[PDB]
Amino acid sequence: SMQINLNSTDPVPSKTPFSVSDADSYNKKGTVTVYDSQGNAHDMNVYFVKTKDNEWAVYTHDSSDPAATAPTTASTTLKFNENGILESGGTVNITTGTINGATAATFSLSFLNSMQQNTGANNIVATNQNGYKPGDLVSYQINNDGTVVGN
Amino acid sequence: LDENRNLVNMQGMQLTGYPATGTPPTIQQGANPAPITIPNTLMAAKSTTTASMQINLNSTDPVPSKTPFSVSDADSYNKKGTVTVYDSQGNAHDMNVYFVKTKDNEWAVYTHDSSDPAATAPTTASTTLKFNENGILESGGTVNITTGTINGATAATFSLSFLNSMQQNTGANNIVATNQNGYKPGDLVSYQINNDGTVVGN
Amino acid sequence: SFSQAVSGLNAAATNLDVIGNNIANSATYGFKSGTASFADMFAGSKVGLGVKVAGITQDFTDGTTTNTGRGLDVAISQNGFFRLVDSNGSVFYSRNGQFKLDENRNLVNMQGMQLTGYPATGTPPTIQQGANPAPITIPNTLMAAKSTTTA
Amino acid sequence: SFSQAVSGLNAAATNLDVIGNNIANSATYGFKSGTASFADMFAGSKVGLGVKVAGITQDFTDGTTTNTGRGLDVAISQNGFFRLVDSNGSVFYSRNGQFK
Amino acid sequence: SFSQAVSGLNAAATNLDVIGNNIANSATYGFKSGTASFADMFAGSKVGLG
Amino acid sequence: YSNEQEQVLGQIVLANFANNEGLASQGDNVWAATQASGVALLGTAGSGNFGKLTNGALEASNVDLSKELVNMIVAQRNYQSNAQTIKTQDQILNTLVNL
Amino acid sequence: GKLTNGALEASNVDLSKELVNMIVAQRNYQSNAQTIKTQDQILNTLVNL
Amino acid sequence: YSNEQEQVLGQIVLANFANNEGLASQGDNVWAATQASGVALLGTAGSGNF
Amino acid sequence: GKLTNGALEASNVDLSKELVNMIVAQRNYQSNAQTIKTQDQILNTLVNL
């Protein structure tokens, strides 16, 4: 999940088409670190490019995979209503690459609660994901309600 | 202030109080007490519905020389003022209000949105303020004003008021007060507890 | 029946230890004082079984800013916390702004904890405000030249 | 208990020794001031076990340049260190420029 | 507590050093005098630290 | 650099917490985020809910020595009062045993 | 940096700062001594029970 | 060493037990592993549960 | 190490650090004496039965 705030006053980037190397080709870049089946970290980069007022094309790339194909097609399209609330395109199923033969992870990226209004600039409100890496026991505790929790 | 944004004591029991409901939020004392929470939830924008401009006018001002009106020409009008309103997305609309003296105690006010580049310059009177024998505003103090449509946001229409405006032998035309009920989105900066128990987030 | 007197003595000792620790760390840039919070432990009867320390609360008020001058030194005003990582990847936070460059040219504090931040990549490098925070490095490698393409 | 106050006294004494070294070295060509950096010693409990001296940091600010009229006297402006060798071949670095 | 007086003393010493440097360059062609600029150091509390 | 051109190597990130009192101190003037303090919100200085950075300066501790000394005096007196209570219970028990 | 001939780089020790820091340090030391005195009185009180 | 090069000689090992309270104290600030404490887990400092 | 002529290596005993340890060890000694007195009273109340 990625809740973001976008500015309605941003001009459309001049440098068509979108290029990862070209900073002028996109409006905003964010990163989310996901974990595959084995536990390798994939730094998925999500790019927001404004096309028409109330429209934002979203591209995705894998920064941990050296063999990931260059994104040439818009991954999804966020459309915000006239009140700045997201209307459609807030969820998309995305599959990462393969690193050292590890099975790629297919996960639903959701832009729920994302809003486009007259903020200061493009700011990412929150990012989260439900995957993790292998972990070793460090400590244990008994909470107030009696639940035993290992950290 | 715990992780869930509730006000709790050292032992974790949640402080209770009257909650705020509605827009703008106000304390509704008819409800049962509920735990007090302070979310970071960004505050959304409010498109303007009421604006007010109190101004004092000079009696000795001569009528504009260069008829007809042009928003470009300064000598074409007596006074120009700016009020910032906000649409559904919180975008800033800079309403320029133009004062041209027409006859004795009669002042035509024009409204033009300068934030929209494609908006046409007004050519017809938006309102005609009428001042009585001594400043006392007579009629025309309230006018419906419609914004332009900027960047796909809903245009905000609002009632703009000239109540308590006066026209006398003041030295020059200068704006006394400009108010509007709209605001742009804002993030939580601070929180405080007043001496009356109200929890206020700035 | 010493149930109350022993608890009171322990609470007084805890408070005195907190006061002494505050006195001792008086010259520790980035130190916040502490205060013990006490609570009674009535249990069924009305005799007031004793007292207990409900916790130790910090005092996160900004201290006086002293212009030591050393360039690396950075003082923080209002809210915020400096973010560091140890050799094992754990994330820690500190208000102490006394930094130095180690042998591998990594911004570290007195204890060797690596200061983190948004790194820059590309040519010319741009601050990757999205890129997950990484340790900040100051390489001494010679800077390459850019062929003139716009004048 | 006693440990916190003992550590505080030790840190204050170390600071005072650093100050004394600086003040006794006020007239020393190429000397750089020192400052003691302290850190607390929280360990598990929230009681704040005490403080410790994290280290002593030198202040490498360029000092005032004073002329002497000797041809073998040279001072390093900005950054840079004189490289010296002892009898055993061990290397050393110093900002003092008094040579004979 | 002590930090306020320390900051005041350091500012006064800086001003004295600037004045002494300006006097030392009383005869220095092309030299332009310098003056220190001071500002208070309020931080949260209304005491106005230094 | 020496070619009359500069580069940007990084930008120091700042962290803000919902519960400052929930941070567990690990020593060496270093704090660690735990369950009570919530997840760290990251940002830059001067933007959002973060204060700016002062260069060439350090933030000293907020420990006032006068208040600490007075509190030490008061806590010593409270400790001695509790010790007097302990002595009272000791004398009561001694009186009962001597019966 | 460049080298200046016929001169030496003096120390960077400013005396006023050293004096003020000495005053602060001594007072801190006295405060910690008072803390030790308080805890000593505490232990005496507990022993003399 | 004197040849401007350092050489490692070994690494101190750390042992953690499932039950610290089950260790049988042998005196001389020394503990011994027992069945109640369980088999000692060996490792390096600063990693895992060390 | 090197040899410096016309110089002497003074002792490494710091008086401050010692006096504090003297106070702490005094308190430990008094606590042990208190334990001895407690065991003495134990034997007394057992004997006088």
Side-chain angles (χ1 to χ4, degrees):
Chain A
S1 186
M2 188 184 214
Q3 179 182 359
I4 206 166
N5 289 349
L6 295 164
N7 211 310
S8 73
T9 64
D10 286 25
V12 289
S14 58
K15 192 52 183 273
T16 55
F18 161 106
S19 165
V20 294
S21 316
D22 290 358
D24 53 354
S25 78
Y26 58 70
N27 294 87
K28 172 62 136 162
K29 172 210 62 181
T31 42
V32 52
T33 308
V34 303
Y35 299 93
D36 71 357
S37 307
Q38 155 183 82
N40 304 301
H42 293 204
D43 319 57
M44 292 278 301
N45 289 201
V46 166
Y47 297 88
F48 304 81
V49 188
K50 191 179 175 187
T51 71
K52 298 203 302 296
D53 301 301
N54 309 2
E55 276 197 299
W56 294 78
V58 152
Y59 297 75
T60 54
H61 192 37
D62 189 313
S63 161
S64 297
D65 197 317
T69 56
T72 80
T73 82
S75 308
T76 190
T77 303
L78 301 153
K79 257 202 179 262
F80 298 91
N81 58 12
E82 280 69 24
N83 292 329
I85 321 292
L86 181 66
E87 200 180 352
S88 64
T91 53
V92 58
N93 297 326
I94 319 198
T95 301
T96 80
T98 294
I99 167 154
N100 295 122
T103 301
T106 299
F107 62 95
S108 100
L109 179 59
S110 89
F111 299 98
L112 257 283
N113 304 97
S114 303
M115 292 185 22
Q116 155 172 8
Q117 292 194 219
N118 190 231
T119 74
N122 320 337
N123 183 58
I124 323 190
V125 164
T127 61
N128 47 311
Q129 59 91 32
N130 72 277
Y132 46 106
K133 91 185 82 183
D136 326 308
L137 183 53
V138 176
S139 62
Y140 44 77
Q141 61 180 60
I142 306 169
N143 297 333
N144 168 320
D145 42 358
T147 57
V148 189
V149 173
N151 309 314
Chain B
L1 204 168
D2 60 357
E3 65 283 29
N4 281 55
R5 295 312 211 111
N6 309 37
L7 287 186
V8 316
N9 65 351
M10 292 339 314
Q11 303 83 39
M13 316 187 180
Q14 301 159 296
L15 185 67
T16 68
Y18 296 122
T21 60
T23 307
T26 54
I27 297 300
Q28 77 144 359
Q29 321 144 356
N32 315 66
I36 277 165
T37 205
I38 301 165
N40 220 239
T41 301
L42 194 88
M43 143 184 292
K46 174 132 153 297
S47 35
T48 301
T49 61
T50 279
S52 46
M53 180 145 157
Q54 155 149 313
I55 208 164
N56 45 3
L57 255 290
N58 172 33
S59 73
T60 308
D61 304 320
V63 284
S65 58
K66 260 174 80 95
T67 318
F69 193 71
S70 168
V71 316
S72 315
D73 260 38
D75 50 1
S76 78
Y77 47 52
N78 294 89
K79 186 57 183 202
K80 178 181 175 170
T82 301
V83 171
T84 300
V85 277
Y86 297 123
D87 56 11
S88 63
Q89 296 192 270
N91 307 298
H93 296 252
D94 324 286
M95 301 285 158
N96 294 180
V97 277
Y98 298 84
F99 289 9
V100 279
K101 185 171 201 313
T102 57
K103 314 93 171 173
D104 296 336
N105 318 331
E106 291 255 350
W107 288 83
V109 54
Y110 289 7
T111 82
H112 168 62
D113 163 358
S114 317
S115 298
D116 181 17
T120 53
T123 58
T124 305
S126 184
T127 292
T128 301
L129 304 177
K130 310 195 180 212
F131 295 120
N132 240 354
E133 284 309 300
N134 16 52
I136 166 189
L137 163 61
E138 180 185 52
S139 64
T142 284
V143 55
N144 291 327
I145 294 188
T146 303
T147 38
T149 279
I150 287 180
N151 292 121
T154 297
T157 202
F158 58 95
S159 170
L160 183 136
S161 178
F162 276 92
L163 271 283
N164 307 273
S165 305
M166 296 222 323
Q167 171 277 328
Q168 285 209 77
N169 192 233
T170 279
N173 325 323
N174 57 37
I175 323 182
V176 202
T178 57
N179 322 67
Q180 56 91 35
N181 37 6
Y183 49 62
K184 60 192 307 310
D187 190 353
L188 210 170
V189 175
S190 65
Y191 53 89
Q192 60 184 58
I193 305 172
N194 294 332
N195 44 67
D196 48 45
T198 54
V199 189
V200 180
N202 313 316
Chain C
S1 170
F2 298 66
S3 299
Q4 22 257 356
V6 169
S7 72
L9 211 78
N10 293 359
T14 298
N15 193 4
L16 267 165
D17 293 11
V18 171
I19 293 162
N21 168 59
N22 292 358
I23 289 194
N25 299 243
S26 173
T28 305
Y29 302 120
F31 183 73
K32 303 308 178 188
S33 66
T35 303
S37 98
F38 305 102
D40 44 61
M41 25 174 47
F42 284 65
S45 299
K46 335 283 302 202
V47 282
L49 270 295
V51 82
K52 57 172 303 273
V53 182
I56 286 191
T57 86
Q58 219 85 7
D59 182 308
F60 275 104
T61 302
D62 303 68
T64 314
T65 314
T66 37
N67 300 3
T68 62
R70 187 209 327 178
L72 282 327
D73 306 1
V74 178
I76 205 189
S77 60
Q78 282 106 66
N79 221 347
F81 286 84
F82 273 161
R83 187 181 180 271
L84 315 169
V85 292
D86 73 332
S87 298
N88 298 346
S90 298
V91 188
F92 290 96
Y93 313 107
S94 189
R95 311 255 310 174
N96 183 315
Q98 182 154 328
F99 298 121
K100 71 184 182 191
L101 310 142
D102 80 18
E103 53 273 31
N104 299 358
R105 279 304 267 295
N106 299 119
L107 277 178
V108 278
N109 57 325
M110 301 305 318
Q111 293 79 39
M113 279 208 156
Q114 297 168 296
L115 178 62
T116 66
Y118 299 129
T121 192
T123 321
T126 81
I127 282 315
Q128 297 294 79
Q129 199 173 0
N132 260 183
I136 288 203
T137 325
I138 304 207
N140 89 312
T141 62
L142 190 136
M143 184 215 177
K146 179 181 174 204
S147 211
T148 304
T149 64
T150 55
Chain D
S1 150
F2 264 118
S3 55
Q4 326 184 7
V6 166
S7 70
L9 267 188
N10 292 359
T14 295
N15 190 4
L16 262 171
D17 308 342
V18 168
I19 291 162
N21 171 56
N22 297 1
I23 182 185
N25 279 287
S26 79
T28 299
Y29 299 123
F31 178 69
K32 312 311 220 174
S33 288
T35 304
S37 294
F38 309 107
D40 49 48
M41 331 185 298
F42 283 71
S45 300
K46 315 171 188 176
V47 296
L49 292 54
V51 84
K52 38 152 306 188
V53 181
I56 297 171
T57 89
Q58 293 274 10
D59 164 284
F60 295 102
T61 53
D62 206 32
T64 54
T65 304
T66 82
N67 80 330
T68 37
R70 276 186 75 252
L72 287 183
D73 287 12
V74 54
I76 316 176
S77 287
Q78 317 306 334
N79 231 304
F81 288 82
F82 292 128
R83 188 186 180 272
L84 312 170
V85 69
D86 60 354
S87 59
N88 308 349
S90 304
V91 86
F92 293 104
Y93 314 80
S94 87
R95 307 276 313 231
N96 181 312
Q98 194 139 20
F99 315 109
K100 46 189 289 284
Chain E
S1 149
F2 253 107
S3 303
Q4 325 187 2
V6 168
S7 304
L9 205 71
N10 274 297
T14 294
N15 198 4
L16 265 183
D17 299 0
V18 167
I19 295 161
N21 173 58
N22 293 359
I23 293 195
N25 293 295
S26 147
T28 303
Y29 285 128
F31 180 66
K32 306 307 177 186
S33 68
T35 302
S37 41
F38 306 101
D40 50 4
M41 182 45 257
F42 274 70
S45 147
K46 303 74 161 183
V47 152
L49 330 180
Chain F
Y1 284 120
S2 149
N3 59 353
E4 184 22 77
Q5 214 88 0
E6 72 295 330
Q7 287 198 88
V8 197
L9 308 179
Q11 195 211 18
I12 295 166
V13 73
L14 296 186
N16 170 358
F17 297 89
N19 182 25
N20 292 349
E21 281 66 50
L23 280 102
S25 42
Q26 304 299 298
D28 319 279
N29 33 54
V30 157
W31 280 284
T34 174
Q35 141 187 318
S37 34
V39 296
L41 280 193
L42 276 310
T44 205
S47 290
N49 205 39
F50 302 99
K52 59 166 334 180
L53 305 200
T54 310
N55 238 33
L58 277 146
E59 149 165 333
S61 58
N62 58 351
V63 171
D64 191 3
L65 272 194
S66 316
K67 325 208 137 180
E68 294 317 306
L69 293 181
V70 183
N71 297 357
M72 173 164 300
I73 282 180
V74 182
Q76 183 177 4
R77 279 304 166 284
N78 302 1
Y79 197 115
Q80 296 181 3
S81 313
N82 285 298
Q84 229 59 15
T85 297
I86 294 179
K87 194 203 320 302
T88 282
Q89 302 265 273
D90 261 10
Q91 310 214 320
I92 286 327
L93 274 206
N94 192 351
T95 297
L96 254 73
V97 185
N98 277 4
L99 285 202
Chain G
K2 45 172 301 203
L3 270 72
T4 284
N5 186 24
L8 292 88
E9 158 154 9
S11 57
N12 61 351
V13 174
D14 199 6
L15 220 50
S16 318
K17 165 203 174 187
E18 295 319 301
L19 294 179
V20 182
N21 299 358
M22 208 176 36
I23 290 181
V24 173
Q26 176 181 358
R27 295 301 111 178
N28 288 298
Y29 194 101
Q30 292 181 0
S31 178
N32 291 295
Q34 261 267 316
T35 297
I36 280 192
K37 174 162 201 143
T38 296
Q39 295 204 233
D40 213 359
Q41 298 185 304
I42 294 167
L43 267 200
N44 293 308
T45 298
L46 270 184
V47 168
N48 284 304
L49 290 183
Chain H
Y1 292 74
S2 55
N3 60 28
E4 327 161 293
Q5 263 219 352
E6 51 76 21
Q7 172 198 319
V8 69
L9 311 99
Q11 189 169 25
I12 299 166
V13 74
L14 255 50
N16 254 300
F17 291 87
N19 175 14
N20 287 347
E21 293 87 22
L23 292 165
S25 42
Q26 305 299 299
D28 303 348
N29 40 284
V30 153
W31 285 277
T34 40
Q35 185 181 70
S37 63
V39 189
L41 291 64
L42 294 321
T44 37
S47 293
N49 202 343
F50 302 98
Chain I
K2 338 199 314 293
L3 309 199
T4 304
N5 194 27
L8 279 156
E9 191 196 290
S11 57
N12 58 352
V13 172
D14 222 42
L15 273 194
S16 310
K17 193 176 180 181
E18 296 305 301
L19 296 184
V20 179
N21 297 358
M22 202 150 65
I23 280 181
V24 184
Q26 224 173 314
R27 282 307 163 287
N28 301 358
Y29 189 110
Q30 292 180 358
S31 309
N32 295 294
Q34 211 63 50
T35 295
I36 284 184
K37 164 191 141 292
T38 283
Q39 299 259 339
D40 163 78
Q41 271 144 40
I42 292 168
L43 271 183
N44 164 257
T45 171
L46 254 182
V47 165
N48 274 5
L49 289 202

